[PDB]
Write an enzyme that holds these catalytic residues in place. Structure first.
Site, mmCIF file in Angstrom:
data_model
loop_
_atom_site.group_PDB
_atom_site.id
_atom_site.type_symbol
_atom_site.label_atom_id
_atom_site.label_comp_id
_atom_site.label_asym_id
_atom_site.label_seq_id
_atom_site.Cartn_x
_atom_site.Cartn_y
_atom_site.Cartn_z
ATOM 1 N N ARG A 133 -4.493 1.139 20.727
ATOM 2 C CA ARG A 133 -3.690 2.251 20.176
ATOM 3 C C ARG A 133 -2.465 2.645 21.031
ATOM 4 O O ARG A 133 -1.420 2.963 20.474
ATOM 5 C CB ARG A 133 -4.585 3.463 19.890
ATOM 6 C CG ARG A 133 -3.944 4.497 18.977
ATOM 7 C CD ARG A 133 -4.858 4.940 17.857
ATOM 8 N NE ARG A 133 -4.226 4.785 16.542
ATOM 9 C CZ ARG A 133 -3.431 5.686 15.968
ATOM 10 N NH1 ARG A 133 -3.151 6.827 16.588
ATOM 11 N NH2 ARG A 133 -2.915 5.455 14.770
ATOM 12 N N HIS A 147 0.458 -3.952 6.169
ATOM 13 C CA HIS A 147 -0.836 -3.958 6.849
ATOM 14 C C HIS A 147 -1.994 -4.513 5.987
ATOM 15 O O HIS A 147 -3.110 -4.546 6.470
ATOM 16 C CB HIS A 147 -1.169 -2.565 7.373
ATOM 17 C CG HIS A 147 -1.251 -1.562 6.276
ATOM 18 N ND1 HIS A 147 -0.112 -1.021 5.719
ATOM 19 C CD2 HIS A 147 -2.330 -1.073 5.630
ATOM 20 C CE1 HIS A 147 -0.531 -0.207 4.767
ATOM 21 N NE2 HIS A 147 -1.857 -0.193 4.689
ATOM 22 N N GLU A 148 -1.740 -4.964 4.744
ATOM 23 C CA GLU A 148 -2.784 -5.541 3.888
ATOM 24 C C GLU A 148 -2.428 -6.992 3.693
ATOM 25 O O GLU A 148 -1.503 -7.301 2.939
ATOM 26 C CB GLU A 148 -2.831 -4.868 2.511
ATOM 27 C CG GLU A 148 -3.537 -3.531 2.425
ATOM 28 C CD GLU A 148 -3.879 -3.123 1.002
ATOM 29 O OE1 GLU A 148 -3.141 -3.530 0.080
ATOM 30 O OE2 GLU A 148 -4.896 -2.425 0.797
ATOM 31 N N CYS A 189 -12.162 2.537 17.121
ATOM 32 C CA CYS A 189 -11.875 1.889 18.403
ATOM 33 C C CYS A 189 -10.455 2.233 18.794
ATOM 34 O O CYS A 189 -9.555 2.114 17.964
ATOM 35 C CB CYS A 189 -12.036 0.378 18.265
ATOM 36 S SG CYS A 189 -11.472 -0.563 19.714
ATOM 37 N N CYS A 233 -12.802 -3.676 19.434
ATOM 38 C CA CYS A 233 -12.949 -4.408 20.701
ATOM 39 C C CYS A 233 -14.389 -4.770 20.973
ATOM 40 O O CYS A 233 -14.609 -5.662 21.774
ATOM 41 C CB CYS A 233 -12.340 -3.650 21.877
ATOM 42 S SG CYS A 233 -13.268 -2.170 22.361
ATOM 43 N N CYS A 284 -15.914 -0.650 23.766
ATOM 44 C CA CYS A 284 -15.556 0.729 24.103
ATOM 45 C C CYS A 284 -16.606 1.773 23.717
ATOM 46 O O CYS A 284 -17.632 1.454 23.094
ATOM 47 C CB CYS A 284 -14.180 1.088 23.547
ATOM 48 S SG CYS A 284 -14.180 1.472 21.776
ATOM 49 N N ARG A 294 -2.411 -2.610 -7.224
ATOM 50 C CA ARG A 294 -1.912 -3.413 -6.118
ATOM 51 C C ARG A 294 -0.955 -4.519 -6.575
ATOM 52 O O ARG A 294 -1.216 -5.213 -7.563
ATOM 53 C CB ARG A 294 -3.062 -4.012 -5.278
ATOM 54 C CG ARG A 294 -3.695 -3.017 -4.293
ATOM 55 C CD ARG A 294 -2.755 -2.624 -3.181
ATOM 56 N NE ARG A 294 -3.422 -1.838 -2.144
ATOM 57 C CZ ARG A 294 -3.475 -0.510 -2.121
ATOM 58 N NH1 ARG A 294 -2.903 0.201 -3.080
ATOM 59 N NH2 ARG A 294 -4.111 0.116 -1.144
ATOM 60 N N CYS A 310 -16.839 1.895 19.792
ATOM 61 C CA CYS A 310 -17.475 0.697 19.209
ATOM 62 C C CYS A 310 -18.983 0.648 19.450
ATOM 63 O O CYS A 310 -19.727 0.233 18.561
ATOM 64 C CB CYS A 310 -16.806 -0.587 19.699
ATOM 65 S SG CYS A 310 -15.122 -0.843 19.076
ATOM 66 N N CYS A 317 -7.434 -3.164 3.649
ATOM 67 C CA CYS A 317 -7.227 -1.710 3.550
ATOM 68 C C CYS A 317 -7.874 -0.875 2.410
ATOM 69 O O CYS A 317 -8.929 -0.293 2.638
ATOM 70 C CB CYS A 317 -5.767 -1.330 3.771
ATOM 71 S SG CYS A 317 -5.472 0.456 3.781
ATOM 72 N N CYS A 370 0.846 -1.181 0.000
ATOM 73 C CA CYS A 370 0.000 0.000 0.000
ATOM 74 C C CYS A 370 0.887 1.239 0.000
ATOM 75 O O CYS A 370 2.053 1.176 0.436
ATOM 76 C CB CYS A 370 -0.902 -0.035 1.229
ATOM 77 S SG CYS A 370 -1.943 1.425 1.439
ATOM 78 N N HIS A 371 0.319 2.380 -0.446
ATOM 79 C CA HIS A 371 1.014 3.668 -0.449
ATOM 80 C C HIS A 371 1.409 4.039 0.981
ATOM 81 O O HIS A 371 2.480 4.593 1.173
ATOM 82 C CB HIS A 371 0.147 4.774 -1.068
ATOM 83 C CG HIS A 371 0.874 6.076 -1.144
ATOM 84 N ND1 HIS A 371 0.708 7.055 -0.172
ATOM 85 C CD2 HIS A 371 1.822 6.485 -2.021
ATOM 86 C CE1 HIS A 371 1.521 8.040 -0.519
ATOM 87 N NE2 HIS A 371 2.221 7.737 -1.618
ATOM 88 N N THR A 372 0.561 3.666 1.988
ATOM 89 C CA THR A 372 0.798 3.869 3.422
ATOM 90 C C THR A 372 2.097 3.215 3.897
ATOM 91 O O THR A 372 2.767 3.780 4.763
ATOM 92 C CB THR A 372 -0.431 3.474 4.236
ATOM 93 O OG1 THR A 372 -1.445 4.420 3.947
ATOM 94 C CG2 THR A 372 -0.182 3.495 5.735
#
Ligand SMILES: NC(=O)c1ccc[n+]([C@@H]2O[C@H](COP(=O)([O-])OP(=O)(O)OC[C@H]3O[C@@H](n4cnc5c(N)ncnc54)[C@H](O)[C@@H]3O)[C@@H](O)[C@H]2O)c1
Ligand SMILES: NC(=O)c1ccc[n+]([C@@H]2O[C@H](COP(=O)([O-])OP(=O)(O)OC[C@H]3O[C@@H](n4cnc5c(N)ncnc54)[C@H](O)[C@@H]3O)[C@@H](O)[C@H]2O)c1
Ligand SMILES: [Zn+2]
Ligand SMILES: [Zn+2]
Ligand SMILES: [Zn+2]
Ligand SMILES: [Zn+2]
Lengths: 379, 379
Positions: B117, B69-70, B113, B99, B102, B372, B105, B177, B47-49
């Protein structure tokens, strides 16, 4: 009317140049043309928007002009094709027109009709692209399509709200600007849910109407922010439950608010017109859902700024114009609500003066120690 | 599982410093602790991220780290208290945790959520505030709670979407993502109505998913904006009906769009991460109701700006995070929609490579010659 078809000569407070005290002149007010209404302005209120143009910080500002946009009075005469109002009707001229027939008017998404904008924006009437005001043959520009600082004004029929004739005109003149802006910012723009936690930045007439709007909406907490701690006491009667003075805190105001609300507010409303305070009103909003409504009018060239992550993390940035109310369709309802004791109007008025006191009233306005000032135009 | 309770030695693409090429290393991957899941990453997409953080422009970037992350893979082992997934389950590790208990959520207003973090934002696991990756006893930080550029990764159970085991892991890795981001930016964030006029800034995977989302939403016009005219040809298959290249026009892009849409678009989506383009996307929206959704992730310190008048006149500025989708609750549903051919996934994949080709895959991405790129982790 004894004046029907005739040029009227009356008193008007004329803004000859920016920053110059208003001069009460004898002006000629030409009769209404096609689709226009000549109004006898009985009472007018003063607003920061009038002073903003008067100051010279307005790009649209044209001199010489007749300012004023918050008024109530009686139809002296109507132009050709005008049937929604007639001589003798009690009305509120509005800066926001409602033609009832355009895309903006027919789609219940906005109140921003643009029918007469090309004309009102340049201090003139649509029918002939000329002003109806003159002194020695020379034109005096119209302002916001209203020019309510004149004993007689000429406005487009699409900007005229026909109201209940029992309504006190020395009160309902506020229903043309400040009070609906504050109320509607809550009810129409934000659509505040019961239980909400609201921050109101600036506790002048607009901030107080936002507090009254939020109270009516059933907000659980109404946080009032003002640099003048003397404005806190009167705020309680308008629904404000808590107070913060930014000068009393070294940390940015947004941090102070997040620290009192477990993450930030549900809704914030900037009722000043200060771009730095607009950024703070956005940033004090809660992650995920926090919505900030700009109500204040910033000076030309001022830009708002934030880091885009504030929006990516769920905050919503928006604004309101006349609280999203449709002038001709809704102002008469606000007047009926006022008459039926559903909304406050009287409480926003701190002074009643006469047209000759106009400069003295703008001095009270500069100092900050007043809410609305109402001028009796005919005494 | 042969490796249960044990430390796994596997290959991982490690990012030692910002801007230096990724190095394939043998890493130690500790077993999952309470509430954690160890996953065998079968396929990961870039990903670009990932490139955004590697380029040093992420405020939260930490080095050395395992990016990615993908992904889609299979649960290798679970820590104590984990019941929702078990060894052998097909899963998608998600950067947005859920979760289910919270303030965020249970709110129903957001998917943001914040349970884990304090740990993921600092490259560690919640249970012991340590990383599960190490090289010669020294830690390698996690990235976005996922770290999919490793054959084996350890994630929090609240960040694991269990999916249909028939779904091809080489395709559905994208559902972690970019594809839900674009689709959801339309369906959840903007809530685009049939007949809407849409502007998509940037026609990469995210922009193309926004076009698919808008097409499914029954939008009448989808305007694709890209500085690379080559990206226009494939965009038609994803729903883009019209094209604009800003380099072909002297007037600012917002002016070009306004001119072609009778005042502006109903919805605009910024799918780049460029703050000037974000301002343009807001300004190209129709007065009164127009909405701009920021989808692109901006560099550290970059700010968005506009004149407050844009919002006062009815434009709404908002943003999205993972298209407003609730990870564990909704990612399995999107995998079900894909298998029903209700959503496109395959169409966004231009290249399939191996872990060893990671650097080759990012160079290909830098040149803008792909959508991708999917890495086969075990071949
Ligand atoms: N959008 C619309 O349709 C619309 C309509 C009416 C009025 N307005 C705008 O609303 C604004 C307020 O109107 P008003 O009549 O209530 O004016 P006001 O002068 O009575 O109120 C402004 C208040 O803000 C306070 N203030 C000033 N700087 C501050 C700061 N940095 N932090 C906190 N408080 C601060 C002042 O002390 C004052 O109490 C003006 O800018 C006016 O132009 C907009
Ligand atoms: N908000 C979220 O939750 C989230 C999730 C996933 C991805 N993203 C962000 O989405 C963005 C795009 O992702 P992608 O994988 O589709 O990227 P991409 O690189 O494939 O596409 C970006 C496109 O923008 C175009 N472009 C660049 N500058 C431009 C300009 N000035 N005007 C018009 N077009 C321009 C490029 O030609 C390119 O086609 C990134 O910033 C990524 O971080 C955000
Ligand atoms: Zn006013
Ligand atoms: Zn209209
Ligand atoms: Zn949660
Ligand atoms: Zn991504």
């Amino acid at each position: 009317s004894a004046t029907q078809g005739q040029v009227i000569t009356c008193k008007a407070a004329v803004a000859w140049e920016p920053n110059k005290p208003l001069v009460i002149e004898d002006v000629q007010v030409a009769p209404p043309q096609a689709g226009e209404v000549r109004v006898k302005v009985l009472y007018t209120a003063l607003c920061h928007t009038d002073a903003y143009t008067w100051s010279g910080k307005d790009p649209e500002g044209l001199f010489p002009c007749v300012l004023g946009h918050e008024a109530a009075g009686i139809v002296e005469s109507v132009g050709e094709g005008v049937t929604e109002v007639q001589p003798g009707d009690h009305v509120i001229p509005c800066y926001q027109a409602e033609c009832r027939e355009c895309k903006f008017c027919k789609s219940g998404k906005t109140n921003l009709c643009g029918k007469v904008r090309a004309a009102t924006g340049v201090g003139v009437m649509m029918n002939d692209r000329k002003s109806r005001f003159s002194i020695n043959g020379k034109p005096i520009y119209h302002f916001m399509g209203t020019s309510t600082f004149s004993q007689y004004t000429v406005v487009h029929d699409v900007s005229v709200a026909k109201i209940d004739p029992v309504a006190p005109l020395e009160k309902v003149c506020l229903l043309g600007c400040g009070v609906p802006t504050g109320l509607g910012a809550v009810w129409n723009t934000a659509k505040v849910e019961p239980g909400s936690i609201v921050a109101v930045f600036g506790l002048g007439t607009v901030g107080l109407a936002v507090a009254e709007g939020a109270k009516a909406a059933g907000a659980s907490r109404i946080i009032g922010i003002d640099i003048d701690s003397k404005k806190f006491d009167r705020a309680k009667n308008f629904g404000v439950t808590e107070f913060i003075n930014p000068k009393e805190h070294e940390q940015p105001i947004q941090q102070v608010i997040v620290d009192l609300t477990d993450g930030g507010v549900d809704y914030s409303f900037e009722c000043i017109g200060n771009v730095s305070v607009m950024r703070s009103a956005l940033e004090c909003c809660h992650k995920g859902w926090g919505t900030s409504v700009i109500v204040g009018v910033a000076a030309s060239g001022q830009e708002i700024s934030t880091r885009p992550f504030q929006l990516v993390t769920g905050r919503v940035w928006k604004g309101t114009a006349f609280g999203g109310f449709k002038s001709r369709s809704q102002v008469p309802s606000l007047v009926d609500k006022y008459l039926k004791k559903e909304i406050k109007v009287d409480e926003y008025i701190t002074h009643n003066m006469t047209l000759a006191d106009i400069n003295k009233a703008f001095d009270l306005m500069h100092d900050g120690d007043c809410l609305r000032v109402v001028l009796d135009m005919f005494v």
